């Protein structure tokens, strides 16, 4: 709630950044296979627990 180690804090911060959409300069690339991010977590759906 208020106690999280800094290491456990560094690992949720690395997840708050991974939870951004694919930028719309990626899907005009020549031959990419990416249309969606397909690794977006939602805090309710699935939990990280770390």
């Amino acid at each position: 709630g208020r106690f999280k180690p800094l290491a456990v804090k560094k690992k949720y911060a690395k997840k708050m950044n991974q939870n951004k959409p694919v930028p719309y300069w990626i899907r005009l690339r020549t031959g990419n296979r990416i249309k969606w991010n397909e690794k977006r977590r939602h805090w309710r759906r699935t939990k990280l627990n770390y």
Partner: protein, 118 residues
């Protein structure tokens, strides 16, 4: 016959030569620069980071995470030749360590953001 006034035998205090102070475990060069440019990495421009330059005399730099409130002051003075009184820090929910920095009330903060180009 040596005088032992103890129930135990504690190890005798023999001579203890010091180590040799090996030369170094590295070659890689260092400087005065990298010690002060790694700490203060870039200032911050937000609705709150701007409201604190004018109203207060603070600045906002996104310092590196493993820095030190005493070494943000040294770094300021080494980079921006201004004094720092209170350096409040916080590791944001991005793993990035922000830093608020009072400029001694003698270096106007609004004269550095205009110098530093914030």
């Amino acid at each position: 016959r040596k005088s032992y006034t103890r129930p135990q035998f504690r190890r005798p205090h023999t001579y203890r030569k010091p180590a040799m102070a090996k030369p170094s475990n590295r070659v890689t060069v260092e400087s005065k620069d990298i010690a002060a440019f790694s700490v203060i990495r870039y200032p911050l421009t937000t609705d709150k980071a701007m409201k604190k330059i004018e109203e207060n005399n603070t600045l906002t730099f996104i310092v590196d995470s493993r820095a030190n409130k005493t070494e943000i002051k040294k770094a300021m003075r080494k980079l921006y030749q201004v004094k720092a009184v209170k350096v409040n820090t916080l590791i944001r929910p991005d793993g990035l360590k922000k830093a608020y920095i009072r400029l001694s009330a003698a270096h106007d903060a609004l004269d550095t953001a205009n110098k530093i180009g914030l």
